[PDB]
Amino acid sequence: ARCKVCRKKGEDDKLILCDECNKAFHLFCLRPALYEVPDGEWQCPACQPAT
Ligand SMILES: [Zn+2]
Ligand SMILES: [Zn+2]
């Protein structure tokens, strides 16, 4: 629907909000390999650890 990165409707698969700071993100825009929901990484790249 919408996503704070691209701000575009198209790849409207299974969007994910970051729990911490409520940024709406596509699984694509979060991580290009990611297509299914991470029931754990309820995060966005900034919040996700450098590991
Ligand atoms: Zn997006
Ligand atoms: Zn975040």
Swiss-Prot record:
Family: Belongs to the WAL family. BAZ1B subfamily.
Subcellular location: Nucleus
Domain of life: Eukaryota
Function: Atypical tyrosine-protein kinase that plays a central role in chromatin remodeling and acts as a transcription regulator. Involved in DNA damage response by phosphorylating 'Tyr-142' of histone H2AX (H2AXY142ph). H2AXY142ph plays a central role in DNA repair and acts as a mark that distinguishes between apoptotic and repair responses to genotoxic stress.
Zinc finger boundaries on the chain: PHD-type: 1-50
Tissue: Ubiquitously expressed with high levels of expression in heart, brain, placenta, skeletal muscle and ovary.
Disease: BAZ1B is located in the Williams-Beuren syndrome (WBS) critical region. WBS results from a hemizygous deletion of several genes on chromosome 7q11.23, thought to arise as a consequence of unequal crossing over between highly homologous low-copy repeat sequences flanking the deleted region. Haploinsufficiency of BAZ1B may be the cause of certain cardiovascular and musculo-skeletal abnormalities observed in the disease.
Species this chain originates from: Homo sapiens (Human)
Subunit composition and interactions: Component of the WICH-1 ISWI chromatin remodeling complex, at least composed of SMARCA1 and BAZ1B/WSTF, which regulates the spacing of histone octamers on the DNA template to facilitate access to DNA. Within the WICH-1 ISWI chromatin remodeling complex interacts with SMARCA1; the interaction is direct. Component of the WICH-5 ISWI chromatin remodeling complex (also called the WICH complex), at least composed of SMARCA5/SNF2H and BAZ1B/WSTF, which regulates the spacing of histone octamers on the DNA template to facilitate access to DNA.
Name assigned to this protein: Tyrosine-protein kinase BAZ1B
Top-level taxonomy: Eukaryota, Metazoa, Chordata, Craniata, Vertebrata
